[PDB]
């Protein structure tokens, strides 16, 4: 069974180690999986777990629509769910 | 098949509202539940999710098997599972 979260047949596995966005994307591609989509998890209960975690859009997943746009975030490192 | 983490039957439900230890225990008991035990989660993946969350022993869960006890956890507030 899934070793993490589950929601309509999508099993989310956490990777505790901090890594950049491109590193997260490469590691996710290695395990034949993709990073979470913000729209897929915005209204659901998974958000509390996914907060401050990388998303496919290239920015951290934040519940509030407000975001600190125009700020370079590529240099940051955060946990990723896949 | 619950809205949380499943391990060996027991289901863990996250509460994102910061509460003290006594309040966390009261809420968990009101929901017919008890706070997680350190022994069951120390050696399992669940730790990565329940780190810095309250436990039954009255201290935040920490990966270290043996650590100095601050004993001032009375005034601290952290999220809880149950």
């Amino acid at each position, epitope marked *: 069974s899934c070793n993490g979260l589950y929601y309509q047949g999508s099993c989310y596995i*956490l990777h*505790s*180690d*901090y890594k950049s966005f491109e590193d997260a994307k490469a590691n996710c591609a290695a395990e034949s999986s993709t990073l979470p989509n913000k729209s897929d998890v915005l209204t659901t209960w998974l958000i509390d*777990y996914v907060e*401050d*975690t990388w998303g496919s859009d290239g920015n951290p997943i934040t519940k509030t629509t407000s975001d*600190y746009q125009d*700020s370079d975030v590529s*240099q*940051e*490192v*955060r*946990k990723y769910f896949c | 098949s619950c809205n949380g983490l499943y391990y060996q039957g027991s289901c863990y439900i*996250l509460h994102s509202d910061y509460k003290s230890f006594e309040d966390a225990k009261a809420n968990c008991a009101a929901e017919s539940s008890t706070l997680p035990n350190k022994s069951d989660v120390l050696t399992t993946w669940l730790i*990565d*999710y*329940v*780190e*810095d*969350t309250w436990g039954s022993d009255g201290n935040p869960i920490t990966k*270290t098997t043996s*650590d*100095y006890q*601050d004993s*001032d*956890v009375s*005034q*601290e*507030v*952290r*999220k809880y599972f149950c």
Partner: antibody
Amino acid sequence: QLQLQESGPGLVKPSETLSLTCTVSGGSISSNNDYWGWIRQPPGKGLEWIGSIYYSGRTNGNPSLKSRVNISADTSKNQFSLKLNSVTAADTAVYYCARLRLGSLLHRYRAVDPWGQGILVAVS
Amino acid sequence: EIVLTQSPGTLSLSPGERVTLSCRASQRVSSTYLAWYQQKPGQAPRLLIYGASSRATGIPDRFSGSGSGTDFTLTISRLEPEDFAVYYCQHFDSSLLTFGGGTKVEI
């Protein structure tokens, strides 16, 4: 109980390389939730962040010193070290080895709680 | 990039009053990143507030924090003799770390 202790010389010569090593007792440098960094305070002035390191090997440093900072980590001996080349008289300061906490997934702790005693380094 | 400026370099206060120390950011910075530290002479800094509102372990209830955006404040209701020290405001985001100039509490 996590204590950080610094060891190294205090007589670095101009145009040479410093060698400071910080060792941690009561914990393991292999901590997914924390970085380990060096912060220098010149005597009677404000703090300055001279670098950080992750157990994997990733290095982050302040751009003004990015050219001269080569931080290293050794997990087996549980020691993290700083090397500063092309030293100049303005670098004299008290150096602290600290733990830059990032926090767990649910608890976010963005601060450096544990600091070392600090080691004073000057120049000839 | 991000620079934190503490306008009041030094403050004069007698014991027992309430003191508010202000830290400003060049650009908007989220609350969770900000922190407030205290440093006595000849000792390493000790964490006072993290997240701008959370007291660290062992910090008395006198210290408290508030603010948002480009202005944050650390308020000490009662100034005991120990509270007289330098106070720093720090920005950390898992990347470049920045420290404030510092404000000294004397009489």
